[PDB]
Write a protein that binds this ligand. Structure first.
Ligand SMILES: O=C(O)c1ccc(NC(=O)c2cccc(CC3CCCCC3)n2)c(Nc2cccc(OC(F)(F)F)c2)c1
Ligand SMILES: O=C(O)c1ccc(NC(=O)c2cccc(CC3CCCCC3)n2)c(Nc2cccc(OC(F)(F)F)c2)c1
Length: 193
């Protein structure tokens, strides 16, 4: 069970013909998001690995904290981190905690999916946000995502998050028992072979 944290990029209609990144202010009226959104990979169906634990406007942007909870994904990633020369190639040699490093390097981007801003300027009918994705490519305003085993340690790593803002981010992790989150739908794309 891991935590992830970072500032996000806001993307409308991701990876499709109409993809467009949004100014955070285009969606800050719809923050904070206190209810769990799925965390997926590269905006792909059926790659749920976790659930968000809060999305907040802070001084420097929109900060996301999440929980990576998928047993299939954690087991696969961790096995890769211990035995795959390919996974480890772009990481510093001999890391302590290779799983954290592997994730930090291969999935540095947090991408928050939203409806098109033509809906957001007016009054939206339904949910403004759909999910947060861990992304290999496309990070812009977002920071490099931090992965760790305890939520306070993760939020602690960003210097552009104040002690009060951090004290406005840890209440909500500790407000949701990880055990009570739904089981995410990630399946290893290995034994599909
Ligand atoms: O169908 C195939 O054969 C198939 C082949 C390759 C795939 N991935 C990449 O090319 C790729 C590229 C960059 C980053 C990542 C995330 C990994 C990075 C290493 C350590 C954990 C997570 N994946 C995927 N797609 C994929 C979907 C989600 C997670 C994923 O990684 C893992 F399976 F390890 F969970 C792979 C599928
Ligand atoms: O069984 C083993 O010991 C085994 C161990 C490690 C493997 N790969 C990685 O560490 C790795 C890491 C990052 C990207 C990729 C994709 C590359 C390489 C695979 C073919 C697509 C191009 N692979 C795989 N190969 C593999 C197949 C399909 C998906 C996959 O997951 C993922 F790409 F996400 F790592 C890994 C197998």
């Amino acid at each position: 069970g891991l935590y992830v944290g970072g500032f996000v990029d806001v993307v409308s209609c991701p990876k499709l013909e109409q993809e467009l990144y949004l100014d955070p202010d285009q969606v800050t009226d719809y923050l904070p998001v206190t209810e769990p959104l799925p965390i997926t990979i590269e905006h792909l169906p059926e790659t749920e690995v976790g659930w968000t634990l809060g999305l907040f406007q802070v001084s420097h942007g929109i900060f996301c904290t999440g929980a990576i909870t998928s047993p299939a994904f954690l087991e696969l990633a961790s096995r890769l981190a211990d035995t795959s020369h390919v996974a480890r190639a772009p990481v510093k040699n001999l890391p302590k905690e290779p799983l954290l490093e592997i994730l930090h390097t291969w999935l540095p981007g947090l991408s928050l999916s939203s409806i098109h801003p033509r809906e957001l300027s007016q009054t939206p009918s339904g949910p403004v946000f759909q999910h947060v994705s861990l992304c290999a490519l496309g990070r812009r305003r977002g920071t490099v995502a931090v992965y760790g085993h305890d939520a306070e340690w993760v939020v602690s790593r960003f210097s552009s998050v104040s002690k009060s803002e951090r004290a406005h981010i840890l209440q909500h992790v500790s407000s949701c028992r990880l055990e009570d989150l739904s089981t995410p739908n990630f399946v290893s794309p290995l034994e599909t072979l």
